Amino acid sequence: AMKLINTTWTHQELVNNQLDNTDAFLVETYSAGNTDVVFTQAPKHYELLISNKHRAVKDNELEVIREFFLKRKIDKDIVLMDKLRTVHTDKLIEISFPTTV
């Protein structure tokens, strides 16, 4: 089955572009097979950007990716879990996780 692979080490342009020009203070990238994930933390919000150049991203994929970040990467204690926002477009899913701090 499909595992999330941290690919940050070979996305150093993108990591730095996002750190220097955005409110993000953490930027990481991951593969989920041929699906690409960008994960960030900034004051007041974490973000996941999930996209797939070839195909629509499937619902079970979304669920596996989301629950991986929630379990491993996101401090749920500061997240506003009733205020999650998920924007679904054609080949792009955007999940916002507001935070107290």
In the complex, the residues that contact Na ion under the rule CB under 5 A are 19, 24, 40, 42, 45, 47
Q: How far apart are CA 79 and CA 52, in angstroms?
A: 27
Nearer to Na ion, 4 or 39 (CB): 39
Nearer to Na ion, 44 or 58 (CB): 44
Q: Coil, strand, or helix at residue 54?
A: coil
Query: Residue 51 CB, nearest distance to Na ion (Å)?
Result: 16
CB atoms within 10 A of CB 25: 10
Nearer to Na ion, 28 or 57 (CB): 28
C-alpha angle with apex 55: 53 to 58, nearest 5 degrees? 120
Query: Residue 16 CB, nearest distance to Na ion (Å)?
Result: 10
Q: How far apart are CA 95 and CA 9, in angstroms?
A: 23
Query: Residue 20 CB, nearest distance to Na ion (Å)?
Result: 7
